[PDB]
Design a protein around this motif. Structure first.
Motif, PDB file in Angstrom:
ATOM      1  N   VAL C  76     -10.095   5.243  53.834  1.00 17.12           N
ATOM      2  CA  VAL C  76      -9.585   6.483  54.394  1.00 17.12           C
ATOM      3  C   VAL C  76     -10.591   7.232  55.219  1.00 17.12           C
ATOM      4  CG1 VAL C  76      -9.019   8.832  53.847  1.00 17.12           C
ATOM      5  CG2 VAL C  76      -7.754   6.967  52.811  1.00 17.12           C
ATOM      6  N   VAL C  77     -10.244   7.467  56.474  1.00 20.64           N
ATOM      7  CA  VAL C  77     -11.128   8.176  57.372  1.00 20.64           C
ATOM      8  C   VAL C  77     -10.474   9.450  57.788  1.00 20.64           C
ATOM      9  CG1 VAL C  77     -12.578   8.018  59.376  1.00 20.64           C
ATOM     10  CG2 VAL C  77     -11.654   5.937  58.284  1.00 20.64           C
ATOM     11  N   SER C  78     -11.211  10.280  58.511  1.00 18.30           N
ATOM     12  CA  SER C  78     -10.679  11.552  58.964  1.00 18.30           C
ATOM     13  C   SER C  78     -11.341  12.103  60.215  1.00 18.30           C
ATOM     14  CB  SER C  78     -10.793  12.589  57.848  1.00 18.30           C
ATOM     15  OG  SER C  78     -10.425  13.880  58.310  1.00 18.30           O
ATOM     16  N   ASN C  79     -10.526  12.335  61.236  1.00 17.69           N
ATOM     17  CA  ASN C  79     -11.009  12.903  62.485  1.00 17.69           C
ATOM     18  C   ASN C  79      -9.823  13.194  63.377  1.00 17.69           C
ATOM     19  OD1 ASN C  79     -12.601  13.630  64.810  1.00 17.69           O
ATOM     20  ND2 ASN C  79     -14.233  12.298  64.001  1.00 17.69           N
ATOM     21  N   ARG C  80      -9.771  14.421  63.884  1.00 16.64           N
ATOM     22  CA  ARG C  80      -8.675  14.832  64.747  1.00 16.64           C
ATOM     23  C   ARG C  80      -8.603  14.046  66.062  1.00 16.64           C
ATOM     24  NH1 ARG C  80      -7.704  20.985  65.850  1.00 16.64           N
ATOM     25  NH2 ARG C  80      -5.523  20.305  65.682  1.00 16.64           N
ATOM     26  N   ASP C  81      -9.726  13.484  66.507  1.00 15.05           N
ATOM     27  CA  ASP C  81      -9.761  12.756  67.771  1.00 15.05           C
ATOM     28  C   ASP C  81      -9.652  11.251  67.615  1.00 15.05           C
ATOM     29  OD1 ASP C  81     -10.350  11.929  70.481  1.00 15.05           O
ATOM     30  OD2 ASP C  81     -11.333  13.886  70.744  1.00 15.05           O
ATOM     31  N   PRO C  82      -8.438  10.702  67.707  1.00 10.94           N
ATOM     32  CA  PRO C  82      -8.217   9.264  67.566  1.00 10.94           C
ATOM     33  C   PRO C  82      -9.305   8.392  68.187  1.00 10.94           C
ATOM     34  CG  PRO C  82      -6.165  10.303  67.888  1.00 10.94           C
ATOM     35  CD  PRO C  82      -7.210  11.359  68.157  1.00 10.94           C
ATOM     36  N   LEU C  83      -9.837   8.824  69.324  1.00 15.88           N
ATOM     37  CA  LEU C  83     -10.873   8.068  70.014  1.00 15.88           C
ATOM     38  C   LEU C  83     -12.033   7.670  69.100  1.00 15.88           C
ATOM     39  CD1 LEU C  83     -10.900  10.278  73.193  1.00 15.88           C
ATOM     40  CD2 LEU C  83      -9.703   8.089  72.831  1.00 15.88           C
ATOM     41  N   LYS C  84     -12.359   8.523  68.130  1.00 17.98           N
ATOM     42  CA  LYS C  84     -13.458   8.249  67.215  1.00 17.98           C
ATOM     43  C   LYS C  84     -13.035   7.327  66.077  1.00 17.98           C
ATOM     44  CE  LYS C  84     -15.468  12.977  67.936  1.00 17.98           C
ATOM     45  NZ  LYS C  84     -15.989  14.188  67.190  1.00 17.98           N
ATOM     46  N   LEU C  85     -11.752   6.992  66.026  1.00 20.12           N
ATOM     47  CA  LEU C  85     -11.234   6.132  64.973  1.00 20.12           C
ATOM     48  C   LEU C  85     -11.683   4.686  65.052  1.00 20.12           C
ATOM     49  CD1 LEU C  85      -7.608   7.440  64.668  1.00 20.12           C
ATOM     50  CD2 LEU C  85      -9.632   8.025  63.332  1.00 20.12           C
ATOM     51  N   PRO C  86     -11.950   4.082  63.896  1.00 18.55           N
ATOM     52  CA  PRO C  86     -12.400   2.698  63.742  1.00 18.55           C
ATOM     53  C   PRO C  86     -11.295   1.665  63.830  1.00 18.55           C
ATOM     54  CG  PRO C  86     -13.380   4.143  62.114  1.00 18.55           C
ATOM     55  CD  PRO C  86     -12.167   4.824  62.651  1.00 18.55           C
ATOM     56  N   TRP C  87     -10.268   1.945  64.620  1.00 20.28           N
ATOM     57  CA  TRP C  87      -9.151   1.013  64.745  1.00 20.28           C
ATOM     58  C   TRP C  87      -9.612  -0.400  65.107  1.00 20.28           C
ATOM     59  CZ3 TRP C  87      -7.674   3.956  61.823  1.00 20.28           C
ATOM     60  CH2 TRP C  87      -6.736   4.988  61.933  1.00 20.28           C
TER      61      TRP C  87
END
Ligand SMILES: NC(=O)c1ccc[n+]([C@@H]2O[C@H](COP(=O)([O-])OP(=O)(O)OC[C@H]3O[C@@H](n4cnc5c(N)ncnc54)[C@H](O)[C@@H]3O)[C@@H](O)[C@H]2O)c1
Ligand SMILES: NC(=O)c1ccc[n+]([C@@H]2O[C@H](COP(=O)([O-])OP(=O)(O)OC[C@H]3O[C@@H](n4cnc5c(N)ncnc54)[C@H](O)[C@@H]3O)[C@@H](O)[C@H]2O)c1
Ligand SMILES: NC(=O)c1ccc[n+]([C@@H]2O[C@H](COP(=O)([O-])OP(=O)(O)OC[C@H]3O[C@@H](n4cnc5c(N)ncnc54)[C@H](O)[C@@H]3O)[C@@H](O)[C@H]2O)c1
Lengths: 339, 337, 339
Positions: C76-87
């Protein structure tokens, strides 16, 4: 006022930069280019062009990654993966995606992820998520907050749309077909070699080459009323630049004459389409339209109505320059409608 | 008797296959074709050529991994990395490397790994590799060589008649310039390239590019080492090119004497390779010409008794292919293991 | 078989995860959640739910960012900016965008830029670039390569569409209006406070609250034939979940009777819509539809034709569960039509 990046320094991208340079005072400001070749390969080709001719201005190589057009620097990077691009670092506001690869939402958007604010594709979008605009037709339909990824359509579609409008909007287009004798392009083989389209795989320079084209259908994308009424093919002929469209739509209206159909253009030409459409009465040939700022030019003497209902038009458009010029208008828009 | 594999079904790849089909009782036998393109691609382009014209033979797409030519079936595979090609599995005795990338020890070798026995590079070899120009030193070949290059389209032209000159008047020194048709290597429209010249229009310019054929001559005519050197001009034509040699010989000579010598050799030793032509012709008139070089007699001219200029035509595609085949034709003969 | 991420761990997103857990053997596999609250706030709410009730299964907090539902971990991760997501890092194949913020092409696409393969919005798209699907109606219309961003429509639209179809497809819908007594939702104020819609700004719990809704128009997006024929409002009433639609379209066909209109449903219910539509003859009330797998349920005894042409229907649908269940079917599709 607004920082611009150019991803893809080839024909259209370079044609862009040139278009932009010698301009009134565009709010745009090219600060970076992404040509997979360095300052050398990117400079040389901006200075010496086989189709536009030696660029008129001091273009020198500063830094190992920063040429300059008359003093004004332009940082140049190179990487096939937009994600690695310094868009954010540099603070890029608009990106002219002219590679012909990133034409879908996921793709072209990679630029936003890198830190880009807005992305303009110099070609038709493969998605459905993206708006297709055509200066002169439906440019108003664009307003900030509304999609950060737009497509300036096709070279052909941007030549058709304009005068296709005036046709329907003042005569009513029932439906019709069309053809386009088109100057060969980079996607074609120089000599018969492997290519996903066994037509384009043939010597671009020594064949009349038939190849599908959506440019016809896509007209709708800007002119809904026509949705699914136009259509046609395209013919590649040994001519490096400047092409012509052959539209044949049997009108809905009365059965008007030739020279009046023209007058409509002529009217809408010096009026609402002053800068987009135009009619040239003097019998010339392709080569006379090089560097033509008009998105479309009709050959007066060529127009001809047949059976009262069937109208036939022929238009001239520089596929490199013209389009690139609109692409600078469409990027000029974005800036004039920016917070 | 000799199983062959065509890798790089490009212009020389196809110009070759066809060059072959026309030969009678060919020690060669094509069985597999490897090119980035699918069976469709291989068929179409082998049948419909914009320079050689439609191929006279029945060419259908027989199979998912093969094509048919007058019944003779051939497999078409596609691996961008040679090592994978089943050369060993199919017992590939010879590979015609016409891709333009595998021109070095390391590269051409990947074919050997795939199980191939020999690799004939349809271009000049890069580094230490046996270079042979049919008619100029094919006797130098020995079944011992696992990797040989059949030199360039230019060298294969310039060499034959250079031998004739030196071997008769003694070439002291001399430059040359080859007005050459364009090739897949050029950019159709001003686009990036490692040769900002070749990077230009191609069909709208005379593109000066450099050629090795200059020093490559020496490769096969050891005697001329460092005596020759020239450039090349890429002009708007899809095929057939001309060379403009200019050597200074020792033995004072005159116009017709030179030409004479050429003819003599063309009728004896080089019969089939070199040839002369008096009928004032032009490029197009030299398509499909089985010979490597053709002297335009009426053009040959001498100056101050020792400076000789010779113009020579050659079909950079066909004529070369015919040489490529002739070389492979040789490997099949004088083949022990 | 296919890795799934859930961006937005609230009601619909959590309702999702639950739906997915107790399932046959979904090709889907939730491996990450993006709840701006950590493993604590994200766990607790998955285990104890005021509307679904304590989740039946061992849910423990492993790591400082990795809870587990019966052993199976979920990063579980958390950040309002999808760009920073580890997808990309994780290799996410599908992303269930359930935040109600990223609903336009540019936005929802930020997930692709991060490294996502495909994105499903749990709400209507604000663009026009994106396809709107509604399992039961036009799910077939979805095939790989065709847009990597889709919308599972609205809770309401996904309840209407289904039985709206059967109506037109077997009786012909001239046109009609509709209303929807809807359970209040998160977008409403708890107590009278500032809100862009002075209706939603009123105590969600103590008012019948009228608020616009496109759910009506959007029906077309899946059922073109109706384009611009339906329409209506919505009424928020103090009921945390489960809502009802009140459709009033005067038919085109003859002037059929009540109980036969029903039979059509009943027919199309155990037939092509077995799992989507259904008809309940037993007089119940909202609370009896909690956790209802049917995208729509018609109250037999409530249907009634008035003037031969005017038909009136009433349907029951759990806005949280139902929709979430379809959203798992629509994500189930993507996987069944994947290379
Ligand atoms: N000028 C024209 O002829 C014309 C007309 C109208 C529109 N267009 C459209 O513009 C697009 C550009 O093609 P073109 O005709 O200019 O050809 P081109 O090859 O000259 O331009 C392509 C450029 O993009 C770069 N590029 C390619 N792949 C890249 C990648 N992955 N990452 C970064 N850079 C990459 C290339 O290095 C090159 O500089 C095409 O879609 C074309 O249809 C061109
Ligand atoms: N045509 C001439 O004038 C001539 C004559 C002599 C020498 N050469 C040289 O011979 C070489 C062969 O080129 P060509 O004339 O056949 O034209 P070409 O460029 O069309 O041939 C290359 C072909 O090889 C294929 N290929 C490339 N990499 C491959 C790989 N890894 N696996 C399989 N196929 C691959 C390409 O798809 C292409 O079809 C060139 O380097 C050329 O300069 C050309
Ligand atoms: N369950 C329902 O009632 C229901 C019905 C059908 C559809 N929907 C739709 O689902 C969407 C989700 O809303 P909801 O009702 O579940 O409310 P909610 O507030 O419970 O869910 C929103 C979730 O998204 C997260 N989030 C918000 N902004 C974010 C951002 N910028 N980045 C990352 N995460 C962010 C929040 O932290 C929260 O976990 C809405 O558009 C709603 O219309 C909900």
């Amino acid at each position: 006022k607004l920082k611009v990046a150019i991803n893809g320094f080839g024909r259209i991208g370079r044609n862009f930069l040139r278009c932009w340079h010698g301009r009134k005072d565009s709010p745009l400001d090219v600060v970076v280019v992404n040509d997979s070749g360095g300052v050398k390969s990117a400079t040389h080709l901006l200075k010496y062009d086989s189709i536009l001719g030696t660029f008129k201005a001091d273009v020198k190589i500063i830094d190992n990654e920063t040429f300059s057009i008359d003093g004004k620097p332009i940082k140049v990077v190179s990487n096939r993966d937009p994600l690695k691009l310094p868009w954010a670092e540099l603070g890029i506001d608009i990106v002219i995606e002219g590679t012909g690869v990133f034409v879908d939402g996921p793709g072209a958007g990679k630029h936003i992820q890198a830190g880009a604010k807005k992305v303009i594709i110099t070609a038709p979008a493969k998605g459905s998520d993206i708006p297709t605009y055509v200066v002169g037709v439906n440019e108003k339909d664009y307003g900030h907050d509304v999609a950060n990824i737009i497509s300036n359509a096709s070279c052909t579609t941007n030549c058709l749309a304009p005068f296709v409008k005036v046709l329907d909007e003042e005569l009513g287009i029932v439906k019709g077909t069309m053809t386009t004798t088109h100057s060969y392009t980079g996607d074609q083989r120089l000599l018969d070699a492997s290519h996903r389209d066994l037509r384009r795989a043939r010597a671009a320079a020594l064949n009349i080459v038939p190849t599908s084209t959506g440019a016809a259908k896509a007209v709708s994308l800007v002119l809904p009323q026509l949705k699914g009424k136009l259509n046609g093919i395209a013919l590649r002929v040994p001519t490096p630049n400047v092409s012509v469209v052959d539209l044949v739509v049997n009108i809905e209206k009365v059965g008007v004459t030739a020279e009046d159909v023209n007058n409509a253009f002529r009217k809408a030409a010096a009026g609402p389409l002053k800068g987009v459409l135009d009619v040239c009465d003097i019998p010339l040939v392709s080569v006379d339209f090089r560097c033509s700022d008009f998105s479309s030019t009709i050959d007066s003497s060529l127009t001809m109505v047949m059976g009262g209902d069937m109208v036939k038009v022929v238009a001239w458009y520089d596929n490199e320059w013209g389009y690139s010029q609109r692409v600078v208008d469409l990027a000029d828009l974005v800036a004039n409608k920016w917070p | 008797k000799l199983k062959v594999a065509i890798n790089g079904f490009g212009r020389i790849g196809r110009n070759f296959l066809r060059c072959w089909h026309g030969r009678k009782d060919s020690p060669l036998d094509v069985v597999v074709i490897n090119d980035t393109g699918g069976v469709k691609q291989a068929s179409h382009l082998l049948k419909y050529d914009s320079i050689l014209g439609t191929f006279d033979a029945d060419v259908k797409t027989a199979g998912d991994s093969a094509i048919s030519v007058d019944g003779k079936v051939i497999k078409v595979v596609s691996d961008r990395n040679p090592v994978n090609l089943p050369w060993g599995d199919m017992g590939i005795d010879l590979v015609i490397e016409g891709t333009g990338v595998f021109v070095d020890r390391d590269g051409a070798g990947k074919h050997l790994q795939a199980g191939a026995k020999k690799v004939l590079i349809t271009a000049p070899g890069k580094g230490d590799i046996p270079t042979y120009v049919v008619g100029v030193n094919e006797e130098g070949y020995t079944h011992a060589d696992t990797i040989i290059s059949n030199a360039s389209c230019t060298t294969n032209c310039l060499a034959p008649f250079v031998k004739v000159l030196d071997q008769k008047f003694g070439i002291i020194k001399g430059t040359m310039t080859t007005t050459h048709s364009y090739t897949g290597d050029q950019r159709l429209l001003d686009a990036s390239h490692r040769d900002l010249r070749r990077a230009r229009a191609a069909c709208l310019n005379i593109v000066p590019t450099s050629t090795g054929a200059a020093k490559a001559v020496a490769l096969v005519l050891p005697n001329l080492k460092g005596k020759l050197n020239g450039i090349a001009l890429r002009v708007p034509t899809p095929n057939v090119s001309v060379v403009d040699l200019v050597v200074q010989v020792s033995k004072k000579t005159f116009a017709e004497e030179v030409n004479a010598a050429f003819r003599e050799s063309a009728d004896n030793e080089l019969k089939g390779i070199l040839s002369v032509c008096d009928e004032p012709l032009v490029s197009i008139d030299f398509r499909c010409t089985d010979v490597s070089s053709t002297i335009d007699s009426s053009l040959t001219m001498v100056m101050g008794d020792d400076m000789v200029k010779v113009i020579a035509w050659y079909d950079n595609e066909w004529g070369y292919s015919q040489r490529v085949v002739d070389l492979a034709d040789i490997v099949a003969n004088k083949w022990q293991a």
